[PDB]
Design a binder for this molecule. Structure first.
Ligand SMILES: CNC[C@H](O)c1ccc(O)c(O)c1
Length: 133
């Protein structure tokens, strides 16, 4: 029994480039920057991470794509949380990319933030499975 949003049919069999849509392209830069600035004030010791599903990847979608990551949390630990959230069976694979790269699983998310944070203050991560449509 899928949990939200995976009780919805996304109709991937006709999803087009005219329909692709992500956090950056759905919300104005200025609104995004103001939100991460608010988080720096209100949750100072959290790293704000936008985590979204790679395009056409064969893996469940995620409800909350916005994470308040503890500063000393490793990449390995963050991957485990996403796995948990999409209820991915342990026998199926999951990878996260930063700048189209697999970060080293022992790396602190704080370090990845300092190296790769967006002009808008967020860290953008992409997750995917082994296959894609
Ligand atoms: C699609 N029909 C309802 C939906 O499947 C649904 C309802 C309650 C839930 O807790 C749930 O995970 C999914």
């Amino acid at each position: 029994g899928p949990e939200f949003p995976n009780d919805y049919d996304f109709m991937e069999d006709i999803l087009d480039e005219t329909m692709k849509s992500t956090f950056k392209s759905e919300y104005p830069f200025e609104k995004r920057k103001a939100e991460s600035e608010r988080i720096a004030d209100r949750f100072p010791n959290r790293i704000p991470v936008i985590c979204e599903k790679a395009e056409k990847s064969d893996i469940p979608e995620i409800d909350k794509r916005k994470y308040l990551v503890p500063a000393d949390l490793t990449v390995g630990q963050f991957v485990y949380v996403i796995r948990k959230r999409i209820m991915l069976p342990p026998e199926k694979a999951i990878f996260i990319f930063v700048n189209d790269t697999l970060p080293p699983t022992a790396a602190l998310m704080s370090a990845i933030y300092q190296e790769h944070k967006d002009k808008d203050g967020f860290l953008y991560v992409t997750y995917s499975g082994e296959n894609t449509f």
